[PDB]
Amino acid sequence: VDSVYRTRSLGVAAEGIPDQYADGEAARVWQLYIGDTRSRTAEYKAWLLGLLRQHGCHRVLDVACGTGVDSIMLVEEGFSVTSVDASDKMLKYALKERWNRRKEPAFDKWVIEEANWLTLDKDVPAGDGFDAVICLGNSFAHLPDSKGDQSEHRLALKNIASMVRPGGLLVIDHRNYDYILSTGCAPPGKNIYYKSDLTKDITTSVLTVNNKAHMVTLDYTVQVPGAGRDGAPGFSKFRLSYYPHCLASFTELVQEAFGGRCQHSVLGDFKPYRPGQAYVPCYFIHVLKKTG
Template sequence: MGASRRERSSKYKNWLLGVLQSKKCHRILDLACGKGVDSVFLLEQGMEVVSCDDAEAMLVYARSEKTRLGLKDWVVKRANWLTLSEDLPDQEPFDAVLCLGSSILHLVDLPPQLGLYRKCLTNFRKFLKPGGLLLIDHRNLDSMLDHGIAVNKNIYHKVDTVSDVSMEVIEKDGVRQRVDIIYHLVVKSDETGNTNLEKVLIPIAPVHVHEFTALLKEMFGSNCNYSLYGDLELQEHVDTEDTAYFQHVVHE
């Protein structure tokens, strides 16, 4: 897939930069860096970025981008959210911690306990300076769990590569175990230039937005400043019918 098809939308870049600059964030920990698209963008804005992922295939690409772009000061490391302190032993706290790209729900955890997420958020918080920001997002699962509808909107990317989204709720003994999301991706061959459809199935946790909001407020305390965005727009009333992705911003 060409670079233009990975490029972030202007709306997303303006939103991300605006949130970070509003709190004068300079030192950033990108905990789900993937191929490094967000990290490179923030580095280009003059920020200091440490980027992590637990998928070696993603890190190989990010490191190749580091070399290609000559970004000698960009730190790219392998790290798991559940063992973050052990994986990043020498890092000082950050102004902001990012876990974006709808990554958190890929770690399949079950409500109401959400023990894995509690561990992750505890680790995320350890890497925040006092007054630091956590930015974390996820797909709108409410519409899927409650109505069987997967809202499909191009929010994050400049070029829309998802032609359709379908889903299946997986249950065991009447308890929801996960949601299998099937992305129908438009893939362009670099060799022939032809466009094909490719289906990618991703299992994610069956978590409603109010459950995730409550968890964040519990983990960061009642005095934290919390804002909820839907498709990058600040939400006064939670819209679970026409939102593709929720973005949570927590300011200690």
Template sequence: MNYESKKDRPCADGREARIWYLYVGDVDARLSNYKGTLLKILEERSVRTVYDCACGTGIDSVMLLEEGYKVVSTDALDVFLEKAQEMKQKREELADWQIGVGDWLDLKSAEVDHPALGYDAIICIGNSFCALPDFEGGSNTHLKALQNFKDLLKKGGILIIDHRNYDYILVHKTFPPKSHGSIYYNSNRVFNIKADLVEDEDISIIFRSDMDVSGTELEGDSDIKLKERDGKMVPTLELNNIPMYPHTLKGFTALLKTAFGEEAEHRLLPDFRENEQEDFVPNYWVHVIVNEQ
């Protein structure tokens, strides 16, 4: 199965992009949660070229372009890429930004020109990688994608990739405590969050939640229902998100070591935080691994 084929993509209309923006919340607030640490990592490795292989609407790509990095951006969903293209067309300084459809399982066919010598860094953040099912079983699909990332990196280049704290979610059936916040998705519109484990051909988790769309263009959507929130009835959109593969911390670390080698330098950051207390419960585990070969 190939995400570059439209029939295999997890969602395919512009409405999804509008919902995603509401789910993200304030863009500046999102970036403030991890921008400093991300830029520090890139600076420490003398990174100049970055491949954002799960760029969505381009929030992180544009931030990196503004910081002077040369960025190539792809995503499997062209409805998100349309938003990125709109942003590019509005700003002359983004004229050299390459944007195109890209499938992790066939990156050679991506609609961009990859540098012949490879990238200094690849980023795949926002729990994006977990949207890839294990089509072949035995994590072979995930390993193929990780190997494709590795093949596009220079020697000494880094992959920055993350996943939700599924160890916590599998036990508690919801996200970690709200007091710790979410580094990517900060909307205060989302409520009634539940996590359902599905064990069919592939193991996956489906997050189900409600979104208060009061005062937005989605308020008149045909799927809107009135639901109680904090004692009030509000126009609500039920979110049945795409299935996510529940990578555990131990399991995903093992996958990275298999793809990059047991001796590869590997760094783990809870919610992009450095020197965090041992009892901190992150929403995301962020991995930084070096291509040593």
């Protein structure tokens, strides 16, 4: 009989030694990635703020906090933001940010907490709800579908809709998987939210279970600036997976999470969307208003 014997269990920590895979070549390059995506776009900044002001929103919940890029922007712009994420590895960066600028009143009232979409309703006190709830950056696409049916999906979206106060808003997006699925290719460097200063190639792998798109895996070969000899760069790789959400299905889901009592409109990239339009967007943004 063969047996495996590890130093410490998967998941535990120990004073003095880095956590399990903190220094892998992958975690390394990944830090370059989540870093490189900070250079917020003008089109993006003007669009979100306008939408929010146009609706008189004020207290907003960011359910895909990440390193806190979209939240810091709402914070500096006077909104009363409460940010939550399920990933502690990414949450650590927002927390660092808050602490640095903690001397600023606006940053001292910024609430960052850990929450999970699947249990959101019990992790974050909605109270009367929020004005705008936001889930941008194709972040919902991370939640895989383990049970076959999209039960987990429906659960997260329902909870997410839960934090939206009546007459309130929900701004959630997804990448254009309708196009990725038909091309088999997900163009890199193609972003609308943040300008990428890093260079990368992207290998798109699509897993089709019996006959239904089940997952899209992306392999990022990032060119790291000065990891070569006479200045030349190096090439490290890392991988991430997403659930290929189609405009039609997602549209059914998000609406069904509101029980039908909602206002739905899907934007192309940042401009309106009408099926049949020559323009194929990289992102599909959904802005739902809670009418009941």
